Design a protein around this ligand. Structure first.
Ligand SMILES: O=C(O)CNC(=O)C(=O)O
Ligand SMILES: [Mg+2]
Ligand code: NI
Ligand SMILES: [Zn+2]
Length: 331
């Protein structure tokens, strides 16, 4: 078995290997990359996502989210308070202000220490989940707006034609903005490109060990667990690396820098934080190997998780027993 310790792997494809996206994912899996839950892909030196980022300031963040924490430094939840609209130029100025800017630090490990010590005492503002793309239309390789769709994959594998669409999302971050512990909708893959700015640190649990994280989460968040049998689908719970180590949960960590891709694999729990002002683009995708994970994915039916239009068909076809209850949660 390849990669039996489930380490995060880093790949350096050549420009020739960068042509065929599906083929390269399958290659990475042949080397055991999926066992980690997360992989890094450094694009060939010839490649670029677009020519410059000089003209992005007028993008609108219609609903910036202030991420307010509750709990203790290593075990907390966050809720999202909606703020008034602002442009990317206005948000960048805010990120750089004395109130929100990255503190002085020695290196990424020092900044990580400071994040876990101090996150809960601040409420950073995240421009998340903005439909759109920063890839130039002429970028033909690893263009996250030109991937094969999940609906087409389901149709190719299973023969069933379904409604729905699959488009990318932009994320504008600042220091301390946080992504809570989660797997993707329907335990899909994700791919995330850091277009510009400061890094993003990731934590990940190997897919084969995801239920260990779920059992810890039920212990640490006992009211939430009584409320919902899949409350990590709410995307609000944080657990620090120190607490994971104290409870024996297997995990790994890595920092993504501008110009780098990350891929999350089916049922790879992940969480993380931004170092400073940045912009990322991400989208879900599927392969043949996902179908079995989609059939087994947990679902939130309590009403909290509320998701896209296109998840309806995935539940309806892959999980017809669960469909009626899940749809009630959506309505
Ligand atoms: O960058 C973020 O805030 C969160 N991204 C992801 O969870 C992802 O790409 O799967
Ligand atoms: Mg603009
Ligand atoms: Ni994710
Ligand atoms: Zn729920």
């Amino acid at each position: 078995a390849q990669n039996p310790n489930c380490n995060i792997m880093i790949f350096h494809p050549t420009k020739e290997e960068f042509n065929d996206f599906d083929k390269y994912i399958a290659y990475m899996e042949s080397q055991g990359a999926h066992r980690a839950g997360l992989a890094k892909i450094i694009p060939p030196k010839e490649w670029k996502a677009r020519e410059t980022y000089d003209n992005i300031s007028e993008i609108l963040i219609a609903t910036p989210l202030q991420q307010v924490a509750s709990g203790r430094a290593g075990v907390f939840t966050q809720y999202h308070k909606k703020k008034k609209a602002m442009t990317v130029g206005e948000y960048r100025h805010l990120a750089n202000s004395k109130k929100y800017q990255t503190p002085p630090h020695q290196n990424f490990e020092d900044l990580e220490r400071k994040y876990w010590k101090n996150r809960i005492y601040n409420s950073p503002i995240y421009g998340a989940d903005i439909s759109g793309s920063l890839f130039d239309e002429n970028t033909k390789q690893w263009n996250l707006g030109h991937l094969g769709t999940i609906q087409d994959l389901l149709e190719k594998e299973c023969g069933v034609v379904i409604e729905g669409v699959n488009t990318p999302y932009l994320y504008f971050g600042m220091w301390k903005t946080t992504f809570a512990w989660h797997t993707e909708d329907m335990d899909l893959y994700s791919i995330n490109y850091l277009h510009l700015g400061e890094p993003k640190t990731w934590y990940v649990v190997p897919p084969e060990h995801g239920q260990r994280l779920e059992r810890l989460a039920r212990e640490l968040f006992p009211g939430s667990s009584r409320g919902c049998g899949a409350f990590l689908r709410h995307k609000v719970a944080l657990i620090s690396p120190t607490v994971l180590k104290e409870n024996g949960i297997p995990f790994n960590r890595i920092t993504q820098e501008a110009g780098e891709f990350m891929v999350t694999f089916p049922y790879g729990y992940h969480a993380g934080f931004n170092h400073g002002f940045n912009c990322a683009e991400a989208i879900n995708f599927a392969t043949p190997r996902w179908i079995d994970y989609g059939k087994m994915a947990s679902q939130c039916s309590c009403g909290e998780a509320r998701v896209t239009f296109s998840m309806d068909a995935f539940v309806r076809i892959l999980q017809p027993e669960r469909y009626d209850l899940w749809k009630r949660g959506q309505d």
